[PDB]
Amino acid sequence: WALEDFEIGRPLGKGKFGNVYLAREKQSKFILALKVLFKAQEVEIQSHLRHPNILRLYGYFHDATRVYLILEYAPLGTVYRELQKLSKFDEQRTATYITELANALSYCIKPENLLLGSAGELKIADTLDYLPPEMIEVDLWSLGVLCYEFLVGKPPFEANTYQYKRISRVEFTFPDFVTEGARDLISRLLKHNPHPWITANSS
Numbered sequence: 647w648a649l650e651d652f653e654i655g656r657p658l659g660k661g662k663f664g665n666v667y668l669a670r671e672k673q674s675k676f677i678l679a680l681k682v683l684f685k686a687q688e689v690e691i692q693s694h695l696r697h698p699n700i701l702r703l704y705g706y707f708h709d710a711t712r713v714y715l716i717l718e719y720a721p722l723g724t725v726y727r728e729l730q731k732l733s734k735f736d737e738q739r740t741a742t743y744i745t746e747l748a749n750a751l752s753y754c755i756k757p758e759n760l761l762l763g764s765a766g767e768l769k770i771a772d773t774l775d776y777l778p779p780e781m782i783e784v785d786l787w788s789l790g791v792l793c794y795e796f797l798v799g800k801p802p803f804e805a806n807t808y809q810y811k812r813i814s815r816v817e818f819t820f821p822d823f824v825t826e827g828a829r830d831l832i833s834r835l836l837k838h839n840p841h842p843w844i845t846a847n848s849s
C-alpha cells in the first residue's frame with residue numbers, strides 16, 4: 647500500500663479526529679478513511695478483528711516521515727452530532743444503540759468516538775463525564791452513562807467544575823419522561839460497586 651494509491655478529500659473530524667481524511671482507493675473507486683501520523687510522533691490486532699459494530703482497520707503503511715491508517719468510512723457521521731441534532735433520542739433508538747454497543751464490547755466510549763454506518767448502525771472507534779468512580783478515585787458504567795445521555799441529552803453527572811464528587815457519590819436524578827425500565831437498566835449500570843427494556847424497545 648502507498649499514499650499514491652488514494653484520493654484525499656476533506657478532513658472528517660476536526661476534534662482530535664482532525665487527522666482523518668475522506669479518502670478513496672484509486673483503482674476500485676471505493677470511499678475509505680485515512681488517518682495520518684508523523685512517525686517522529688495496536689495496528690496488527692485490529693486488522694483481523696472483524697465485527698459489524700466495530701470500524702474495520704483495513705491496513706497500514708508508511709514512508710520516510712509518516713504513518714497512514716486505512717479505515718472504514720462511516721457515512722452518517724458521529725452519534726455525537728446526531729445527539730446535537732435531535733437534542734435527545736427516543737427509546738427505540740437508544741435501546742438499539744445499546745445492544746449494538748454491548749455486542750461490540752462482548753466481542754472485545756463517548757458519543758464523539760461513536761460512528762454511524764450506512765443503515766444508521768453504531769460502530770466503535772478507538773475527561774470525567776464517562777469515567778467510573780473506581781477509575782477516578784468500567785465499560786458497563788460507560789454504557790450506563792451513554793444510555794442516560796441518549797435518553798436525556800446530557801450526561802448524568804454534569805456539574806460546573808471538575809471538582810468529581812457527583813460521580814464518586816453517584817448523585818444523579820431522572821427527568822420525568824424516563825421510564826422505570828430505562829431507570830432500572832441505568833441505575834443497575836451506575837452502581838458504585840463494579841434486559842426487558844432493551845428487548846421490547848430495540849431493532
Ligand SMILES: CC(C)CCNC(=O)Cn1cc(-c2ccc3c(-c4nc5ccccc5[nH]4)n[nH]c3c2)cn1
Nearest residue numbers: 658663679681688689715718719720721723771772
Ligand atoms: C492502530 C489503530 C488502533 C488505529 C485505528 N483508529 C484510529 O485511527 C482512530 N480513529 C479515527 C477514526 C475515525 C474518525 C472518524 C471517522 C469517520 C467519519 N465519517 C464521517 C462522516 C461525516 C462526519 C464525520 C465523519 N467521520 N469515518 N470513519 C472514521 C474513523 C477511527 N479511528
